[PDB]
Amino acid sequence: GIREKIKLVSSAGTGHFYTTTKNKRTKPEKLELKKFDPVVRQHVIYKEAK
Amino acid sequence: RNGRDSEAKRLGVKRFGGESVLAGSIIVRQRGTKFHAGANVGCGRDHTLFAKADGKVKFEVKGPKNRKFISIEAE
Amino acid sequence: GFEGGQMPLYRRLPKFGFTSRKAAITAEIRLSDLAKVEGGVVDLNTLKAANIIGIQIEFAKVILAGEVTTPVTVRGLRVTKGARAAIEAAGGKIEE
Amino acid sequence: PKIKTVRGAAKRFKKTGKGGFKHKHANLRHILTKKATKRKRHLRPKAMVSKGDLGLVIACLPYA
RNA sequence: UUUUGUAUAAUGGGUCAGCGACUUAUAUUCUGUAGCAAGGUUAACCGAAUAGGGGAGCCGAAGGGAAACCGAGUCUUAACU
RNA sequence: AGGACCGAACCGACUAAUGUUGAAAAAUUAGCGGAUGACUUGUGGCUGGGGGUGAAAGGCCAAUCAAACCGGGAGAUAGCU
RNA sequence: GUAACGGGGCUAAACCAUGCACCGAAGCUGCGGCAGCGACGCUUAUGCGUUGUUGGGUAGGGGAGCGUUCUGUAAGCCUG
RNA sequence: GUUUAUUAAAAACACAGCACUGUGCAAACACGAAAGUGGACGUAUACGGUGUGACGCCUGCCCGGUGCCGGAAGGUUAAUUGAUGGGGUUAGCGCAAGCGAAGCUCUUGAUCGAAGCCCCGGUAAACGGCGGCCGGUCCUAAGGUAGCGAAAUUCCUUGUCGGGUAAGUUCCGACCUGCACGAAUGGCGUAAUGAUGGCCAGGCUGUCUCCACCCGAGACUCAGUGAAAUUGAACUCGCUGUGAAGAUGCAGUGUACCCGCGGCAAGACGGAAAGACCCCGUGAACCUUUACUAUAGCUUGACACUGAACAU
RNA sequence: CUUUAAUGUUUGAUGUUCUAACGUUGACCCGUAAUCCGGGUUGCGGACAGUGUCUGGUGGGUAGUUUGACUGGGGCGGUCUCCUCCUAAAGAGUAACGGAGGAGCACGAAGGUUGGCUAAUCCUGGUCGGACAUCAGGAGGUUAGUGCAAUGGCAUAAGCCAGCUUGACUGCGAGCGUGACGGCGCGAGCAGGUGCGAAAGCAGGUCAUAGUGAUCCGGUGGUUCUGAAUGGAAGGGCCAUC
């Protein structure tokens, strides 16, 4: 319902992104997580986008 | 007001005491841990009990609470 | 394919892939066909003369299938590793 | 006259070596965030048409 | 005939005689049979014409992959036990 | 004088009986309305089918009318008998 | 219209219990015949002194045949 | 007067009268790809459309909604036009990632751009609408006026009271708690007219109590000619049961010598018409509309046919 | 090159005038002893009207159609996909317009891991204190809790608290279960890289089971796989995703 779809984009420039959801109303701060980037095969910071 | 039901889930003991099992075969499907896991038996995320080794299924009752355990005995 | 109004299998599954125009002009040559050619030399034009491949084939590749028991010269055709070994085991040659 | 191929099936199926038909899986086109990565990874490869559907596919693809 | 079910008060037929309904064409798959066999076979066409020529083509002897491509392997994957 | 009155011809058709494999695919008998008018009638002509005509009832358009008849698409289609 | 034993009739020819007998089917056995499916020994393009067994049937599936007209066989054969 | 030729003749249609509305004449409108024709060889005292329907008294209030009419500051808005931006290509420069003129090219879509719709006013004999609350007040566009009313309209209802009858669900008169009258989809009356609906009375009667007799045409017999529907086959009874559930045909039982003729209609689920009612089929056809998608017609604008001067 | 005055000059506009396009169902002449038609002269209109293409609005005037099924007939009412229980006859499964309830989410912590902990209720005593606020002890032993229905589970806790964290990872997957199928589900284990823990190890989201929508068309990111003479590019494919 309220909880809207976003993508978390790699910070390695590979164009890889994960996709998730976020409640924008509560906790509006941008999401940031160490996720595995398979293009570079390293754990890298992924930042909220879209 | 009462014309509703859910698709039956086909839960239950899929493999009975003493039968031979290959590794990975589901023994019992269950809501909650009605059967607990013992030797060479793994518990799944939805509490499914499956064989972690090739063997024969064995049922037992163990522990202070008289709980039922599924074990696989290597043949 | 009618299933009584249920969405049939072909409309229920997705489309995939594309058709390559390179494939229609590519062809495969078995080792048995290397001795059917006339003159002992192997090439597109002589294979077309011997009726091993169609007139419109522009690319060919010899593969390990059958046996070659005579010296054979190959030119302008790809050859697999096994077919290359088989040709060279019978006193042949391969040229690019 | 020649039998006419069903072109949707001609786009959906390909014949294999032993006579079966391969196809791409359904449910991997557009509501992908909620689906588990395990499910999509298992859907990605191709699959063989089943016995119940082989007759329909063969009727649709006479010249395959 | 149709039905779960018809002596049925369910349909059909007044009787006889004549006619009256799964065919033909082309494709394709399977079975039998015959010829040839890693080969099989021609179409149109020519032809003093059911001969003979015509192998243009078609199927088969190699598959995998969306594809390039590789090839008794190939695809998937950075790579597969 | 009168879309006046009674009433034959003429034009109609309110009631009843008959008849309903009829004398007749709409009539006969007895009664009944109009009967110088928006009357009636002969001869010829015009309006044609999604059209005509209609003091209007979906009425009439060759015994056929909520879309004539003939021929064609046509062996329409019929998951029904 | 008797019309609540099928009827006649029945004090048992009714009910209970116990016995021995009989009737009773297209069931079973007897004798004769046909066909199929097998297994058998002599044997061989097989059938049989054999042997066991099977043989109701709609929709439907499979197997084998009869008969009609026409073509060759056939200017043959039959026929005033 | 007209009307469903062939089950409806009427309260239905028409009508004289009245009102609204359109129409200035190459009229509106209609038939027509068009030419042309009717309207009309007429000209607003005319012609078309629409509604009501002699005549008498009349015809109340509402322009909020839909429609039509008129006017407009402004908003949005098509075709057409194409400012700016982005991308492809390659001249060139590049010890090169790459950049990248001009031309052609794909894409964006600044600006101009009419009616329409939004908005304001009129119009009800346009479509239509016409209250509650407590013994002043809310709401509305306004709150049913005149007249009529158990009515062709009143469910309860055979409303109540009266008239007429011995007895009156009908009729007549009055009443008013009008389920659910009402003023040109007209309201209320109205002399005359009516093969019009309802009620009552005199006369008359075989309508009836309750049928009798008679005269003719059939029916019946004789001679002549000579159909039809229907029909699986019949050696074609009653009853009780049974049974695809209502039996000439089954079971049990009773009765019954064989065959005609005149009659009657209780059965042969009698004959006639593949039920019209009901349901169904992703059936058909007609009609409606603010269902959908279209379209003729009408209307707006741009370009063409299509030009010259002049002033701002 | 910044800015700013004018016209011959190019189209934009309003207006007025004009005539030669175009109209005349005005008059007179002729073809012609002819209310047609045409030509001509003249008047009246006049770049308007009107016609062609394109365009916005209107448009039951006309046309083609659609308007579901289930259903103790049909209609009106209800329902239609998913989850829990019961009917359901002690494996699975099992119908009715049978009996009862829920879902169409939520959470970057409410996930992972390490360490720690243990409830409801009542009894008694105690400042404001009431039958029920916090504190102290006692009985009690899950009569609590679980993000949301129900069932089944949970003390090794799956319930509560805190520290560090992103395994709500990527490729695969022996083997199973459940489906007519499309599919759905569980899964040890291998490779890569990572979090927590001294370590053994745990982690491929959450106590489990509802929280969902095939295909086609198309949009975005990546990928030189393809690229219709050649090099590009468009378009298409593959991967992620709306």
UniProtKB/Swiss-Prot annotation, chain A:
PROSITE patterns: RIBOSOMAL_L33
Pfam families from the UniProt entry: Ribosomal_L33
An example Gene Ontology molecular-function term: structural constituent of ribosome
Superkingdom of the source species: Bacteria
Disulfide bonds: none
Acyltransferase among keywords: no
InterPro entries: Ribosomal_bL33 (IPR001705), Ribosomal_bL33_CS (IPR018264), Ribosomal_bL33_sf (IPR038584), Ribosomal_zn-bd (IPR011332)
The keyword Heme appears for this protein: no
One annotated GO biological process: cytoplasmic translation
GO terms for cellular component: cytoplasm; cytosol; cytosolic large ribosomal subunit
Keyword annotations from UniProtKB, A to Z: Methylation, Ribonucleoprotein, Ribosomal protein, RNA-binding, tRNA-binding
Miscellaneous information on this protein: Surface exposed on the 50S subunit.
Subunit annotation: Part of the 50S ribosomal subunit. Cross-links to the P and E site tRNAs.
Protein family per UniProt: Belongs to the bacterial ribosomal protein bL33 family.
Protein name: Large ribosomal subunit protein bL33
Organism: Escherichia coli (strain K12)
UniProtKB/Swiss-Prot annotation, chain B:
Protein family per UniProt: Belongs to the bacterial ribosomal protein bL27 family.
Coiled coil (UniProt feature): none
GO BP terms, alphabetized: assembly of large subunit precursor of preribosome; cytoplasmic translation; cytosolic ribosome assembly; positive regulation of ribosome biogenesis; regulation of cell growth; ribosomal large subunit assembly
Alphabetically ordered keywords of this record: Ribonucleoprotein, Ribosomal protein, RNA-binding, rRNA-binding, tRNA-binding
An example molecular function term from Gene Ontology annotations: tRNA binding
GO CC annotations, alphabetized: cytoplasm; cytosolic large ribosomal subunit
Organism: Escherichia coli (strain K12)
NCBIfam families in the record: L27
Entries under PROSITE patterns matching the protein: RIBOSOMAL_L27
Subunit description: Part of the 50S ribosomal subunit. Cross-links to the 23S rRNA. Cross-links to the A and P site tRNAs.
InterPro entries associated with the record: Ribosomal_bL27, Ribosomal_bL27_CS
The protein's name in its UniProt record: Large ribosomal subunit protein bL27
Keyword Transport: no
Gene3D superfamilies cross-referenced by the UniProt entry: 2.40.50.100
Source organism, top-level taxon: Bacteria
UniProtKB/Swiss-Prot annotation, chain C:
Keyword tags: Ribonucleoprotein, Ribosomal protein, RNA-binding, rRNA-binding
GO molecular-function term, one example from the UniProt record: rRNA binding
GO biological process terms held by the UniProt record: cytoplasmic translation
Recorded GO CC terms: cytoplasm; cytosolic large ribosomal subunit
Coiled-coil ranges (or none): none
Subunit text: Part of the 50S ribosomal subunit. Contacts the 5S rRNA.
Family: Belongs to the universal ribosomal protein uL15 family.
Role this protein plays: This protein binds the 5S rRNA. It is required for the late stages of subunit assembly, and is essential for 5S rRNA assembly onto the ribosome.
Protein name: Large ribosomal subunit protein uL15
Organism: Escherichia coli (strain K12)
Swiss-Prot record, chain D:
Top-level taxon: Bacteria
InterPro entries: Ribosomal_bL35, Ribosomal_bL35-like, Ribosomal_bL35_CS, Ribosomal_bL35_sf
Example of a GO cellular component annotation carried by this entry: cytoplasm
Record field: compositional bias (Basic residues): 9-21
Keyword match Ribosomal protein: yes
Stretch list, region Disordered: 1-21
Protein's recorded name: Large ribosomal subunit protein bL35
Recorded family membership: Belongs to the bacterial ribosomal protein bL35 family.
Database matches in HAMAP family: Ribosomal_bL35
Subunit structure: Part of the 50S ribosomal subunit.
Biological process according to GO: cytoplasmic translation
PROSITE patterns registered for this protein in UniProt: RIBOSOMAL_L35
Keywords: Ribonucleoprotein, Ribosomal protein
Entry GO MF terms: structural constituent of ribosome
Organism the protein comes from: Escherichia coli (strain K12)
